[PDB]
């Protein structure tokens, strides 16, 4: 649930 929002992404 985060395809544009993207949860993640190298934190």
Same mark, same amino acid.
């Given at each position: 649930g985060s395809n544009? /929002?993207?949860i993640? /992404?190298?934190m």
């Open positions: 544009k /929002g993207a993640i /992404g190298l």
